[PDB]
Write a protein that binds this ligand. Sequence first.
Ligand SMILES: CCCCCCCCCCCCCCCCCC(=O)OC[C@H](COP(=O)([O-])OCC(O)COP(=O)([O-])OC[C@@H](COC(=O)CCCCCCCCCCCCCCCCC)OC(=O)CCCCCCCCCCCCCCCCC)OC(=O)CCCCCCCCCCCCCCCCC
Ligand SMILES: CCCCCCCCCCCCCCCCCC(=O)OC[C@H](COP(=O)([O-])OCC(O)COP(=O)([O-])OC[C@@H](COC(=O)CCCCCCCCCCCCCCCCC)OC(=O)CCCCCCCCCCCCCCCCC)OC(=O)CCCCCCCCCCCCCCCCC
Ligand SMILES: CCCCCCCCCCCCCCCCCC(=O)OC[C@H](COP(=O)([O-])OCC(O)COP(=O)([O-])OC[C@@H](COC(=O)CCCCCCCCCCCCCCCCC)OC(=O)CCCCCCCCCCCCCCCCC)OC(=O)CCCCCCCCCCCCCCCCC
Ligand SMILES: CCCCCCCC/C=C/CCCCCCCC(=O)OC[C@H](COP(=O)(O)OCCN)OC(=O)CCCCCCC/C=C/CCCCCCCC
Lengths: 61, 119, 65, 69, 136, 37, 23, 99, 73, 74, 50, 269, 185, 49, 49
Amino acid sequence: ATRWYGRQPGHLLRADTYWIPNLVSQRFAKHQPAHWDGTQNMPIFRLADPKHKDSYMVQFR
Amino acid sequence: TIFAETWEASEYQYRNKANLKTLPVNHLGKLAELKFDFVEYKAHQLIACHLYERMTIHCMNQYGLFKDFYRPECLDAQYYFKTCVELNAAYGIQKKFFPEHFVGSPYARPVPQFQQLGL
Amino acid sequence: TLRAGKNIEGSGQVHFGYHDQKWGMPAIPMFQLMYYELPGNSIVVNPCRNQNYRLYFEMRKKLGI
Amino acid sequence: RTSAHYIEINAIYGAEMMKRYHKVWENIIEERSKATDQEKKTRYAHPSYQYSPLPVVSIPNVLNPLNLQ
Amino acid sequence: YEDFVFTTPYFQPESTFKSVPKLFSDILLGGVEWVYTTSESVLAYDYKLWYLWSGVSNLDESFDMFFNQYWALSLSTSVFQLFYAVILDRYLSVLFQNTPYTNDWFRMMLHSKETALIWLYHPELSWHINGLNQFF
Amino acid sequence: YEDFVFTTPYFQPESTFKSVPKLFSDILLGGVEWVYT
Amino acid sequence: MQNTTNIVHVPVHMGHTHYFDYI
Amino acid sequence: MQNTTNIVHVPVHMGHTHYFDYIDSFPKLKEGPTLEENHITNQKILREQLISGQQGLEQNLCLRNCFKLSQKRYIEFCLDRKCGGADFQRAATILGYTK
Amino acid sequence: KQNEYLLEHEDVKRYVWWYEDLKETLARVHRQANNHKACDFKDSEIILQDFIRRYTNPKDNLPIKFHPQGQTF
Amino acid sequence: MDNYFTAITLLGLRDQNLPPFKDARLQRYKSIKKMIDLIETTTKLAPPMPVELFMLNPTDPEWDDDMTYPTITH
Amino acid sequence: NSALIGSENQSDSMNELNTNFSMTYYILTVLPGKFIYWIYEILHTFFVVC
Amino acid sequence: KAPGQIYAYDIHNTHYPYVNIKQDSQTQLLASFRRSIASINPFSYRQVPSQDRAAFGLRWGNAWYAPNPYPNGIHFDRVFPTHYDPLAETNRTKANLQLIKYAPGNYSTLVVTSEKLPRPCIRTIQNYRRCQMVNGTEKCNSEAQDILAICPNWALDHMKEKVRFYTKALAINNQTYIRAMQVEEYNQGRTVADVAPKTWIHGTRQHLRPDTMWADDRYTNITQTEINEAIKRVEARKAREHEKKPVEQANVNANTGEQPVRVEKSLYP
Amino acid sequence: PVKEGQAKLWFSTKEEADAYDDKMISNIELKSQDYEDENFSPVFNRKTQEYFLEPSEKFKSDFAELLRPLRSLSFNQVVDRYVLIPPNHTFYRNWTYEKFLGGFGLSYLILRELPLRNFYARVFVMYAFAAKVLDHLGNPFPFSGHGQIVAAADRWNHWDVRCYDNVMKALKYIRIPTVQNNIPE
Amino acid sequence: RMRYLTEDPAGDDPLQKTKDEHLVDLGFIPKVFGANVEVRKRAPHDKYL
Amino acid sequence: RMRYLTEDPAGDDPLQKTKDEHLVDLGFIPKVFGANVEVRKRAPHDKYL
Ligand SMILES: CCCCCCCCCCCCCCCCCC(=O)OC[C@H](COP(=O)([O-])OCC(O)COP(=O)([O-])OC[C@@H](COC(=O)CCCCCCCCCCCCCCCCC)OC(=O)CCCCCCCCCCCCCCCCC)OC(=O)CCCCCCCCCCCCCCCCC
Ligand SMILES: CCCCCCCCCCCCCCCCCC(=O)OC[C@H](COP(=O)([O-])OCC(O)COP(=O)([O-])OC[C@@H](COC(=O)CCCCCCCCCCCCCCCCC)OC(=O)CCCCCCCCCCCCCCCCC)OC(=O)CCCCCCCCCCCCCCCCC
Ligand SMILES: CCCCCCCCCCCCCCCCCC(=O)OC[C@H](COP(=O)([O-])OCC(O)COP(=O)([O-])OC[C@@H](COC(=O)CCCCCCCCCCCCCCCCC)OC(=O)CCCCCCCCCCCCCCCCC)OC(=O)CCCCCCCCCCCCCCCCC
Ligand SMILES: CCCCCCCC/C=C/CCCCCCCC(=O)OC[C@H](COP(=O)(O)OCCN)OC(=O)CCCCCCC/C=C/CCCCCCCC
């Protein structure tokens, strides 16, 4: 049960200046209003998981 | 017995044991290491362990079994063929009499009936 | 231990968890007088093995050797 | 440890008994070849089996596939 | 009960007065392990031999003569072509059983390198081996 | 059988034709741990 | 058993990229 | 679970000595006869067996070897072929296997 | 010399006769068609079913009965 | 993939070649499924033979000596 | 591990049969070749970056 | 008192077959020269073992030969995920300490093994069986209790589990029996009397033509004209079969957040 | 037209047979190499004869050459010759490895006396000789590892330790760790 | 949804659960059930992820 | 005799043995037994230690 609850991914901010591709690309990104759909788990950012397509450059050790 | 050319790699991995071996598909790259000319159809290369068997026959027809067959491309073909049919015979028996050892089997981790939940 | 079927996480014998450790003999005369390392050459086959040679002596006499 | 007497004596015993089995095996093949298809299918058969003939086909009686003695 | 059904088998009250004698059992937190390290003489440089059972070398006894002769025999068209395939599959199920009663280490018949040539004369003994292994 | 008794319950031959549809299940050697630093 | 072992019930596709491993 | 954990079914007594941990004694341990007293006792048995227990031995050794076979049908075949047509229940009484 | 007699038991003959019956049965098995269907061995199923019917009782609860010296693999 | 040589022989790979298209080729694989169940059943009907024929009983008390191999330390 | 002094990584190919299919006299033929290409990599890098 | 020779000595008739797998000119020329002088060469090594002398394996240049290990996708990363593919290269690259560690058993197969029960536990089992076949089951209570007492508990767990395994294997063998002995729809009412007098060779290529157009010379004299007329006939037969076609079924794997059924894949993407 | 041969079809009626030929003929695509043909293909010309993989004459003659010494012998002579080798455990079998590996040391005794004038020229020679040894020794540092020698597999491998069970388990078996990560009880 | 349907193998330790041998001696003979081989795991609504 | 009667806890892995849910779906309904609470472990004769 503990391992299963731990795999439900946490929310990790998209804003990142540590990776040089995001440091350049995010200067041209447009922040759009994320309309609330009635939930408490809207993944409007990236997810704190090593296998996520926007978090693979992060070292989860 | 596998009744197809392709098999799911995960269905031959263990669920409750450490996975130290896989059951890989035929190594088609070894077919290009044969220096001589031979005829091979693509319809025979995917069925398990048969490509290594045909490679061994081609090598034992070009060369013999003495001082000419003893080259790295021919000995790896015979070793792969012998090893492949040994692993598949063991995995085949384990699939037949121990199906609950593998990922994807409904008995590896059985889901209970609703009558056992006490609701 | 690994080949015998026990997978090993981490390494070493400095157990982080709930296990006893053995640090190794302190190289001072106090512990070097009480303890000494296990000499492998002292673990022997039991000498009762030599009593099987009684079978040979009796067989040689039966065969008239 | 397993007895070294067993390992070496059993290795000799098994081969010596194989030579005597080879002679018995030759007599059984010879005696069965001279048996009717009815006898070689009903002898040692289950009691509940009813014999029904098969069409006569040509099947050679080869002792050893490789030409060995 | 109170508008709730808890399905249970029939209870047996006779199980209450069950004679259960308490037996001695002591747990020793801190005891013996499986293996222990010894200290003996060690050489500076050594060599480790490897008796590789490659099966592709006809120079030593690892060459599976039966498997190669009966496989090459099944390649040619014969009336026993399907029978030879069944024999080879039964031989592969015998090598799969490496029990104390079927193995080369203890020099068992039709499992060691010594008796590898006997398969050429009597391939019918695979069923005897598979049954003998199940018995012991 | 041959001078041997092997006690087993009554076998049900109908269990042979049991419709068991295969379901997807993939194993990922190399995945996520419980905690990270 | 490998400490990083998971069983997934839905299909996923992994990236064929050097130095990285992700879905 | 502690790696050096053992479940023992017989009582042991541990020594309460500094720097050492071992089993110093077993409760109610009775010492039997010495190795020499057992030797003299065994020699009296082996001497009687050598002098008066060697007549008609070949028949009993054949019956004992037949009863080490796996199946009963092979034991009967051994008794009929090797032991001069002995009966199964009769040979089992001689060897002491009958209740 | 002590165990030479065991090769005279009739079970040795019964074992060889079973092996020769399997050889003749598998030699008679043949491919009948090339329709890539199960009926390509239509007549062979009858030949093998006759062999199985010859050493078992199909109308039993357990036609294949377990004994410690039997065949499992 | 057990019964390899049996399945390869039933498919005809010892004398001919499989159809070059996946439709008929994959149907030919499923065609031997009945025959493998038959041939496997036949191989499990072998009668027993004395185990003490080519193998001495290892549980015999004669082998309790646990004798070692005497060697020469050349 | 063939370059380590008293290695304890017994599971990293220390207790396995490891043969290759390269040229023999390894430290005379193959190993210097890997170092020759290393010198080319850095000399080519120094020429480019400068 | 001559030393025994293995069968391989009679194949090669010598103890010094200078077998080197490395197929370069320098190696094979030196091997031929060394093979001829091996009778009088002090620097000669045997590659055929005997009872009196051990031997070496196959040579690879100056080093030794071993086949490429069978492809095994199992590996363990150290610094970064390498995505090791055993089928991407011919020879397996060596394992570097900072890159990868391969699975154990470079040369290993899968077998089934069994532990050997303790000798005293075996003696009590033999005593129970012997007392059983002589006196019957009901008079072996003393021998049955000696088994439960003398045999350690791990042995009693193994003995209990062997019975459950062979019970499982017994049902698996009988289910295969029931499928094998099942009478199909194409064999209804057919017996051994309806079998054709044929053998295995009657279904081979010489007697039964394979399902390919160039297996023999059957269609080698066909011209374009006969092909066009054959197309008109196969399309005429389709004027009666195209009237039937299965209806489109529901997609059982429509929900992506649901465990999909391992359905048969399409022949083509 | 359709040519008949030894290999026959598998159909009961003639309508089923003729339907099979029509299906196969309607799929034929002629590829001719001559110009002025309605079916002309310089490249991508198909063959009209199917290839079959068979064991050649060299194949079957060499497999029969491996069994030459067995044909002149009976089974009892084969067992007494190659199986029932009389036990003689007095030989120095490892002399083969001692002479080979010990020759490295004896070769160094003679090689260290080379009349090469330059000291650094002999530095090169010893580096080449160390390369020859290190293919077998592996690790040049002491107390670090073991040498690697592939030896022939015969019936006398480990002959004097066949009695020990733990030696067989350590050499042969690689056990698979379970979820309950423990050594077998 | 994928992480919701991501489980680990082998579940929990069976030795820490109620034994069937203990229930028999307590007066309740348990009934043996078969595996539910027809149910497919699915993810809940997004509000529960 | 003490080391002969020295066992380790928990035995072997229960998830590596034949399941009861699998036997039921194979056609064999297993029977549940009770614990043998009456047997006392003892060491064999000295010749077997
Ligand atoms: C009446 C007549 C009486 C006599 C009759 C007989 C006469 C003699 C006939 C000889 C018969 C043949 C001999 C067979 C015995 C071989 C025994 C042996 O130990 O062999 C081991 C040796 C290694 O083989 P191996 O260990 O068995 O491994 C098997 C495979 O090779 C493994 O395959 P691999 O691919 O894995 O291996 C890689 C390959 C590597 O790839 C290679 O093959 C390397 C090739 C590159 C070099 C090629 C150029 C060499 C010549 C340069 C000089 C040219 C001068 C002229 C220039 C003219 C320009 C136009 O091999 C190596 O690794 C080689 C490393 C070992 C040697 C390296 C260092 C050598 C020492 C160098 C310094 C010597 C100083 C001289 C001091 C003198 C006293 C010792 O075998 C050989 O090398 C064969 C050499 C044959 C002779 C070559 C010619 C030498 C010429 C020298 C010129 C300078 C002196 C001139 C004197 C003139 C006198 C007239
Ligand atoms: C970097 C710039 C500078 C360098 C430039 C370098 C340019 C070279 C790069 C290559 C350019 C890409 C185009 C490659 C086309 C493929 C050609 C080919 O492989 O031959 C097959 C081609 C067709 O074989 P087939 O015998 O008709 O097949 C009969 C089967 O029944 C067929 O039935 P099946 O059931 O057996 O199926 C077989 C399957 C086989 O499938 C495959 O193997 C794949 C084939 C790859 C092609 C598929 C993509 C096709 C895309 C169509 C769009 C291509 C437009 C061209 C692009 C040019 C870019 C500017 O399907 C096919 O056969 C594919 C059909 C191939 C037709 C190719 C389309 C015709 C090109 C139209 C323009 C013609 C310009 C020629 C001018 C020559 C002047 C000397 O053979 C010929 O065309 C023979 C040549 C024409 C005969 C007239 C005699 C001319 C002799 C000229 C000798 C001098 C040669 C040039 C010397 C140059 C230096 C002086
Ligand atoms: C009367 C005046 C003269 C008239 C006659 C003139 C003609 C003479 C020639 C004919 C008579 C020869 C008699 C013997 C018959 C042998 C015939 C033969 O073909 O052998 C080829 C022989 C062996 O062929 P092989 O199979 O390729 O084995 C070498 C492999 O490298 C082996 O590699 P491996 O990996 O396979 O195995 C490793 C190897 C270990 O091997 C190595 O590690 C050495 C590798 C060489 C260095 C590595 C760098 C490679 C350099 C490549 C370039 C070299 C090219 C040189 C080409 C030269 C061509 C000849 O360890 C062993 O295998 C076992 C070694 C220990 C066994 C016992 C050996 C006993 C030898 C005899 C002892 C008694 C002699 C007295 C002691 C010496 C005098 C104080 O090749 C050699 O030439 C060996 C040369 C070794 C140095 C010899 C220096 C002494 C010469 C004695 C001369 C007479 C005594 C002095 C008299 C002084 C007043 C005049
Ligand atoms: C002047 C003489 C000086 C001799 C040395 C003095 C010390 C004397 C003390 C010796 C005590 C003897 C105890 C027993 C030793 C046992 C020796 C031994 O084991 O040899 C075994 C074994 C016999 O082989 P098998 O037939 O398989 O075994 C049969 C067993 N019956 O011997 C060998 O392996 C041969 C190797 C012998 C030693 C090495 C010989 C070479 C030494 C180099 C010097 C020779 C220089 C000249 C050589 C000429 C080369 C062209």
